[PDB]
Structures are given as C-alpha cells and as structure tokens.
Design a protein around this motif. Structure first.
Motif, mmCIF file in Angstrom:
data_model
loop_
_atom_site.group_PDB
_atom_site.id
_atom_site.type_symbol
_atom_site.label_atom_id
_atom_site.label_comp_id
_atom_site.label_asym_id
_atom_site.label_seq_id
_atom_site.Cartn_x
_atom_site.Cartn_y
_atom_site.Cartn_z
ATOM 1 N N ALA A 172 -0.291 12.794 24.008
ATOM 2 C CA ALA A 172 -0.997 13.639 24.960
ATOM 3 C C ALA A 172 -2.475 13.727 24.547
ATOM 4 C CB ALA A 172 -0.373 15.036 24.968
ATOM 5 N N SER A 173 -3.395 13.499 25.485
ATOM 6 C CA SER A 173 -4.774 13.899 25.265
ATOM 7 C C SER A 173 -5.003 15.273 25.923
ATOM 8 C CB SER A 173 -5.776 12.845 25.746
ATOM 9 O OG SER A 173 -5.767 12.698 27.152
ATOM 10 N N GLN A 178 -12.179 18.921 21.922
ATOM 11 C CA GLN A 178 -12.671 18.576 20.571
ATOM 12 C C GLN A 178 -12.047 17.282 19.991
ATOM 13 O OE1 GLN A 178 -15.574 20.645 18.980
ATOM 14 N NE2 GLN A 178 -15.528 18.398 18.699
ATOM 15 N N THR A 179 -12.863 16.522 19.248
ATOM 16 C CA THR A 179 -12.426 15.302 18.537
ATOM 17 C C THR A 179 -11.118 15.539 17.753
ATOM 18 O OG1 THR A 179 -13.695 15.515 16.415
ATOM 19 C CG2 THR A 179 -14.904 14.569 18.320
ATOM 20 N N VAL A 180 -10.100 14.731 18.057
ATOM 21 C CA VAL A 180 -8.770 14.872 17.443
ATOM 22 C C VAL A 180 -8.537 13.817 16.374
ATOM 23 C CG1 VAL A 180 -6.256 14.887 17.781
ATOM 24 C CG2 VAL A 180 -7.764 15.879 19.518
ATOM 25 N N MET A 181 -7.957 14.262 15.264
ATOM 26 C CA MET A 181 -7.808 13.460 14.078
ATOM 27 C C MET A 181 -6.341 13.387 13.645
ATOM 28 S SD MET A 181 -10.661 12.064 12.567
ATOM 29 C CE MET A 181 -11.452 13.116 13.770
ATOM 30 N N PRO A 194 -13.121 0.953 15.742
ATOM 31 C CA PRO A 194 -13.375 1.418 14.384
ATOM 32 C C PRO A 194 -12.983 2.924 14.228
ATOM 33 C CG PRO A 194 -15.456 0.954 15.524
ATOM 34 C CD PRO A 194 -14.346 0.624 16.499
ATOM 35 N N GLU A 195 -13.280 3.776 15.203
ATOM 36 C CA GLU A 195 -12.795 5.209 15.121
ATOM 37 C C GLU A 195 -11.286 5.407 14.958
ATOM 38 O OE1 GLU A 195 -13.967 3.841 17.965
ATOM 39 O OE2 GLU A 195 -12.689 4.472 19.646
ATOM 40 N N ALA A 196 -10.499 4.479 15.521
ATOM 41 C CA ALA A 196 -9.054 4.546 15.382
ATOM 42 C C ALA A 196 -8.657 4.083 14.016
ATOM 43 C CB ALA A 196 -8.350 3.722 16.494
ATOM 44 N N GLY A 199 -9.023 7.079 12.045
ATOM 45 C CA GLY A 199 -8.046 8.112 12.384
ATOM 46 C C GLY A 199 -8.324 8.995 13.591
ATOM 47 N N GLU A 200 -9.414 8.784 14.316
ATOM 48 C CA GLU A 200 -9.575 9.488 15.599
ATOM 49 C C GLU A 200 -8.493 9.137 16.596
ATOM 50 O OE1 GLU A 200 -13.376 9.852 17.574
ATOM 51 O OE2 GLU A 200 -14.245 9.222 15.620
ATOM 52 N N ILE A 201 -8.133 10.140 17.367
ATOM 53 C CA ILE A 201 -7.237 9.945 18.506
ATOM 54 C C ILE A 201 -7.942 10.289 19.803
ATOM 55 C CG2 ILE A 201 -5.085 10.644 19.635
ATOM 56 C CD1 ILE A 201 -3.918 10.782 16.766
#
Ligand SMILES: CC(C)(C)C(=O)Oc1ccc2c(c1)nc(NC(=O)c1cccc([N+](=O)[O-])c1)n2CCCO
Length: 295
Positions: A172-173, A178-181, A194-196, A199-201
C-alpha cells in the motif's frame, strides 16, 4: 472471493507436481525461488498452479506473508493488464496459488526466443509496452506499489497481451504524507532504482524499473548478462547519453518492422523513467500517455 481447491485436487491436476518440462511430458513450466509453476488442467480448463517454496532467505512465515499479500492484492485489483487468480490451497502445506493460464510465457523468455519461439515484432512490442503501462497505472490508481517490475513478471496471454504478475511483495502507498523506509530491502537488483536499493518505498521506483523493461523491449537484451559489457543494461542510457553510442546500435536486430520514429519515442520514455532523481521521473499516467502518442 476465490475458489478454495484442496491440495489433493491440485496434486492430481499437475500429475504429482511432476517436475519435468512439458516437452518430455512433465508439468513444470518455470521457477523463481518464490515457488515453481506447474501446468494444470481443471474443467477442460488449463491453469497455472504455483507451489510456494521455502528457500534459505525467508521464514516459513514470511513466505506465508507473500501468500496472503498475493491473495489480498488479487482480491482488490482486477484488470485486463494483470493476471487473474482463480483460487488457492493452504492444506498440505506447500501452499498453492492457481491462476488463469498464460500460454505465451514471460516477456523475458519471449524476448530471448527461449525454446525456439519466434522473435516478437515491433508491432507486438508496442502493444506489450502499452499493456504493461496500463497494468502499472491501475496498480498506482489503487495505491499499490509492486516493488518488482521486470520482464519475467510480465506475462503474455493467447493474444500476446501483457499481464503484470507477482504481487507477494506489493505494498500500500498513500498520498505521500512522508518518505517511507524499509528495513527489508527487496526487488531485483538489475531493475532497481537507487532509492529502492537504499530502502525507500515509493511508486516512483516502479517507474524506474519499468524504464529498464522498455530497454529490454527495444534491444532484446536481458537487464543483466554477466558475460556481456556492459553487464547491466541500464548502463546503455549513459553510453548513448555520453555519445559513445547510438540507440540504433542497440535496437534488437530480430525484427523486420521497426521504424526510427517509434523506436526513438519508446527510447525517450525509457530515458525519462530512468532519471537517477526519483522526482524528475514521469509518473505512470505520463508514461501511459507518451506510449499512446508513440503509436
Ligand atoms: C508454450 C510456450 C510458447 C513456450 C510458453 O510460453 O509456455 C509457457 C512457459 C512458461 C509458462 C507459461 C507458458 N505460462 C506460465 N505461467 C503462467 O501461465 C502464469 C499465469 C498466471 C500467474 C502466474 N504466476 O507465476 O503468478 C503464472 N509459465 C511460467 C512462468 C513464466 O515462464
């Protein structure tokens, strides 16, 4: 909801879960490590039975979470560009998921002409690229993030319509409140933003991966080949971008119907999706529109 098959019924339809290729008359169609895919027959009706498998990397409770999450997403999301779940088994404790059968395999294999299938034409590639973008759009409209967009998870029907699959890691987004980790980094490295990889979601990561898929489609090369230079396909944007290369150098030669204009237009989408900066990337609605303008 879905039908609930008994394990015993599924064991029967798949001949003991018979592990040989269909060629020599077995039932096995393919494997990741999530599980194994078996050709099934129930109701004169051909199906895909995926039997999930524990592999040193996942709990036999984290593999139940991928099970429940596949079911959870397939219940919410029905679309012409996503696979269709028919039902499931949880008793007999292999755990199985049953789908409508996709007779034309993965885009990865169709791209490689595995087992001798003919090369996809440019005409067919375009439809597939648009189909895939449509499936992704539906997902993002429904606040879902796939987390593993790749050609192996794009399946092809009896009309070569593209269908996105493998939802066991979908999340779910939200509005971006806010930036989810992550503390658990998942995905396929050769297709990750690269963000994934940090660990960004975010749904912006699916867009980057899709941009890699567009490269496979244009070039017919897999995303990673250890025996190639460059080993990662994504490295082509830079070559072409730093004029060491032309996109025309890399266009798959196993087509007779490509034109410069639509190929360049498909390449320009892939190049936008592949921004290193997540926020400079087109959104899915934009990718959909540009691929439409391509044809
Ligand atoms: C007959 C040719 C033309 C060679 C061919 O493509 O044969 C196949 C080969 C493999 C295959 C085939 C067909 N179909 C599948 N899988 C499915 O049908 C499937 C449907 C729905 C969901 C899933 N899944 O794994 O979630 C898998 N699979 C397995 C997974 C993709 O390779």
């Amino acid at each position: 909801r879905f039908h609930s098959f008994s394990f015993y019924e599924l064991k029967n339809v798949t001949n003991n879960f018979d592990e040989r290729p269909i060629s020599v008359g077995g039932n096995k169609m393919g494997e990741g490590g999530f599980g194994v895919v078996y050709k099934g027959y129930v109701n004169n009706t051909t199906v895909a039975v995926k039997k999930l498998a524990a592999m040193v990397d996942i709990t036999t409770e984290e593999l139940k979470q991928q099970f429940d999450q596949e079911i959870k997403v397939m219940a919410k999301c029905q679309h012409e560009n996503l696979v269709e779940l028919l039902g499931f088994s949880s008793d007999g404790d292999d755990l199985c998921l049953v789908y409508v059968y996709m007779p034309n395999g993965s885009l990865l294999d169709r791209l490689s002409c595995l087992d001798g299938t003919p090369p996809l034409s440019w005409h067919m590639r375009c439809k597939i690229a648009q189909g895939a973008a449509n499936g992704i759009n539906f997902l993002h409209e429904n606040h879902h993030i796939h987390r593993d967009i790749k050609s192996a998870n794009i399946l092809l029907d009896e009309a070569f319509t593209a269908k996105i699959s493998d939802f066991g890691l979908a999340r779910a987004s939200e509005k971006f409140a806010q930036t989810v980790m992550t503390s658990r980094i998942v995905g396929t490295t050769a297709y990750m933003a690269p963000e994934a990889l940090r660990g960004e979601i975010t749904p912006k990561s699916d867009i980057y991966s899709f941009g890699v898929v567009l490269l496979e489609i244009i070039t017919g090369l897999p995303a990673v080949d250890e025996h190639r230079e460059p080993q990662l396909l994504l490295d082509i944007k830079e070559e072409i971008e730093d004029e060491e290369k032309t996109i025309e150098d890399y266009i798959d030669k196993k087509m007779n119907d490509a034109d410069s204009t639509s190929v360049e237009a498909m390449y320009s989408v892939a190049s936008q999706c592949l921004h290193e900066k997540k926020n400079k990337r087109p959104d899915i609605k934009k990718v959909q529109q540009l691929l439409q303008e391509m044809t």
